[PDB]
């Protein structure tokens, strides 16, 4: 079997993007946030504290013919941003784009923190990292691609992010039209539960490439690029008038700048971030300081690649017993 599903951005800055997934029969349709960075499908719903929810879509379990209590399983789950979930859980029938896992484990949100109820575009958010992050106790659950694995015709995800534009995610297959070249696959480490793996150094606009290695994590729940602060350091340096802004939490620049490129080494081959795709636009409305998408990983305690670097290429989840990651250009 295979899927395939269109990926919109939330907003004009792609903060986020989000996916119709079908829950339930008869389907109900919520738009998921795919995360590479977490591993649990877990959705606002009937049970979410009612103040809790303004705007979103919710899942209805008492609606579902196919929804079944996981007696005694609950989550609870805490992300980088500060932000957190928890609940209760369900098995149900979910489907993307085309391709059905029948038991999926649906985690119901009983308890949402302010930023996902401020958020009126995200129904939820379905984990694309390794099982073994996944928070439900006491009987850990699957992830979608881990329960559709089998009956995949490739053991195989694909992200392809665009830049203020629709993309999509593929299950089971790699469509060789939506890439150009060659695909280079580079090494994961699974230790952590991240699909994490080691870039081979990186440029600054025209500059010449640094071989270092950069250890992180593919990350498409992640807004940011966030590196080593001696590279972005090096980044913004290139930028008059860029500056870290204690006060705003990152790197500043005005608004006025062109920004440089940024290009990352996957192997030996190079993927390039326009310097369009690091601006993220006024820190406040009618500022002309503009905030950048390239921010230091210092005290986040791992490099993140996240949006900004993913939808500069067409990016391969090779769930394969020895997991790979393959990066082409696009």
């Not at 792609?14 to 960075?37: E, S, W």
């Not at 049970?47 to 899942?59: F, H, K, L, N, P």
């Not at 005694?72 to 957190?84: K, L, P, R, V």
């Not at 480490?189 to 994490?196: I, L, V």
């Amino acid at each position: 079997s295979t899927g395939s599903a269109t990926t919109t951005p939330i907003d004009s800055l792609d903060d986020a993007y989000i996916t119709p997934v079908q829950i339930g029969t008869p389907a109900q349709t919520l738009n998921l946030d795919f995360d590479t960075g977490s591993s649990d499908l877990w959705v606002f719903s009937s049970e979410t504290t009612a103040s809790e929810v303004d705007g979103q879509t919710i899942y209805t379990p008492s609606k579902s013919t196919t929804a079944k209590l996981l007696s005694g399983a609950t989550w609870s789950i805490s992300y980088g941003d500060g932000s957190s979930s928890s609940g209760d859980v369900y098995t149900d029938t979910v489907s993307v784009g085309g391709l059905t896992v029948t038991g999926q484990a649906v985690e119901s949100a009983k308890k949402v923190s302010s930023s996902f109820t401020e958020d009126s575009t995200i129904d939820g958010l379905l984990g694309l990292a390794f099982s073994t992050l996944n928070t439900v106790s006491p009987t850990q659950q699957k992830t979608f691609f881990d329960n559709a694995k089998a009956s995949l015709d490739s053991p195989v995800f694909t992200a392809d992010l665009g830049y203020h534009a629709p993309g999509t995610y593929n299950f089971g297959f790699i469509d060789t039209t939506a890439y150009t070249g060659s695909i280079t696959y580079t090494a994961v480490s699974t230790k952590q539960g991240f699909w994490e793996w080691t870039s081979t150094g990186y440029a600054v606009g025209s500059g010449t490439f640094k071989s270092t290695s950069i250890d992180g994590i593919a990350d498409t729940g992640t807004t940011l690029l966030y590196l080593p602060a001696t590279v972005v350091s090096a980044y913004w340096a290139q930028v008059s008038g860029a500056k870290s802004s204690s006060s705003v939490g990152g790197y500043v620049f005005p608004c006025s700048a062109t920004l440089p490129s940024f290009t990352f080494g996957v192997g030996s081959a190079r993927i390039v971030i326009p310097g369009d795709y690091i601006d993220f636009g006024p820190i406040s409305t009618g500022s002309s300081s503009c905030f950048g998408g390239i921010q230091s990983s210092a005290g986040i305690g791992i490099n993140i690649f996240g949006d900004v670097a993913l939808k500069a290429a067409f990016v391969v989840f090779n769930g394969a017993t020895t997991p790979t990651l393959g990066f082409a250009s696009k």
